Amino acid sequence: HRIVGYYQGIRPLTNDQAKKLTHLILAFSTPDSQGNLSPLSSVLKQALKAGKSANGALKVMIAIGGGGFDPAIFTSLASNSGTRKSFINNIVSYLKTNELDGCDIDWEFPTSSDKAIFVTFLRDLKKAMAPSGAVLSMASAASAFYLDPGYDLPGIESAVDFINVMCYDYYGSWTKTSTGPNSPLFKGGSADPSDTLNSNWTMNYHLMKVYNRAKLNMGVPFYGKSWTNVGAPLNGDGLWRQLGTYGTELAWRNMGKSFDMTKTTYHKTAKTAYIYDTATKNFLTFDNPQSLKDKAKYVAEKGIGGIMIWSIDQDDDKLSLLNSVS
């Protein structure tokens, strides 16, 4: 159903890409301490024009905030009814001025002190957006650690048109235990030390809280993560290996020129792709056409309302990943 594509201006949005999306979410605009939104960058502006020109049905939205963005500023703007009201008016004015069709609130992350005020902010923002038909979404966290204290999912659901669930970054630069999958679909069987660092657990968490699952999008990544100097498996399964050193996040479009993709191992239980290169001891966890196909099937099977992608511009020139997901 929905194909919600985040876009961060790595490269121009192509006319083929625009036709494969229902929603294009430019990323990012950030508010200052007074609720003034940063102006749309040139690369984001171009993608808006390219998307609308190539797909008259496409909704082009601005994601406000982001993983880099200080969540205490969201707290400040939303907690005060006066600043909440003016921030909302600034958002609505920003949409009209920049010819946008709506916005995504990417607040990473609301704390327990934010839980109710986040819902109030989204409900009020929806009310101001409703006459123009502007589309409202938010990005949701992937673990109970964040979800339980900070996310009133029923309340959020009552306000937004859909929820973009960030089912990725399950392992990363903070991981001290072992290598592991950035975005597996499932727990990876008996060798998996975790029940929850997978998309299925995160989506099931949301399914158990929200009224209408059609309002959920399962997020998928078009990027992967690498480690170097990686050693032996911890418990007989090559996905979880003795740590060397965190590498970086790589866009899919850049993996094939640095890794021999013919060495891809596809985990049959977790539904996730990785490469361990015994020659170099480099390790890459990523998503590829196979993992994305399995995830689209999961979404259809569970009746989830859509797929969201971070980020479509990380795809290769031939749209291997976007063509696989839809």
d(CA 288, CA 321): 6
- 107 vs 201, which CB is nearer to ligand NAG? 201
State in angstroms the smallest separation of the CB of 200 from ligand NAG.
4
- 301 vs 317, which CB is nearer to ligand NAG? 301
Contact between 137 and 106 under an 8 Å Cβ cutoff? The reply is: no
Site for ligand NAG in 187-206 (CB under 6 A): 187, 200-201, 204
- 14 vs 200, which CB is nearer to ligand NAG? 200
CA 73 to chain centre: 21
R_g over Cα of the chain: 19
CB within 8 Å of 270: residues ≥ 6 apart: 181, 184, 185, 186, 187, 188, 189, 192, 198, 239
State in angstroms the smallest separation of the CB of 284 from ligand NAG.
23
State in angstroms the smallest separation of the CB of 195 from ligand NAG.
7
State in angstroms the smallest separation of the CB of 271 from ligand NAG.
8
State in angstroms the smallest separation of the CB of 72 from ligand NAG.
33
Site map 201..240 versus ligand NAG, x via CB under 6 A:
x--x------------------------------------
d(CA 276, CA 285): 9
- 69 vs 170, which CB is nearer to ligand NAG? 170
Locate 218 and state its tokens: 């399962």
Q: Report CA torsion sign: 179, 181, 182, 188.
A: negative
Site for ligand NAG in 81-140 (CB under 6 A): none
- 187 vs 215, which CB is nearer to ligand NAG? 187
- 87 vs 201, which CB is nearer to ligand NAG? 201
d(CA 309, CA 5): 5
d(CA 191, CA 21): 37
State in angstroms the smallest separation of the CB of 206 from ligand NAG.
12
Total binding residues toward ligand NAG, as defined by CB under 6 A: 5
Helix boundaries (H) for 63-198: 71-79, 81-97, 115-129, 144-150, 153-159
State in angstroms the smallest separation of the CB of 299 from ligand NAG.
13
State in angstroms the smallest separation of the CB of 186 from ligand NAG.
4
CA 91 to chain centre: 21
Alpha-carbon separation of residue 237 from 84, 190, 232, 233, 265 (angstroms):
50, 9, 9, 6, 11
- 186 vs 310, which CB is nearer to ligand NAG? 186
d(CA 294, CA 183): 12
- 241 vs 267, which CB is nearer to ligand NAG? 267
State in angstroms the smallest separation of the CB of 54 from ligand NAG.
37
Contact between 152 and 118 under an 8 Å Cβ cutoff? The reply is: yes
Q: Which of 107, 168, 186, 286 binds ligand NAG (CB under 6 A)?
A: 186
Site map 241..280 versus ligand NAG, x via CB under 6 A:
----------------------------------------
Q: Which residues lie near ligand NAG (CB under 6 A)?
A: 186-187, 200-201, 204
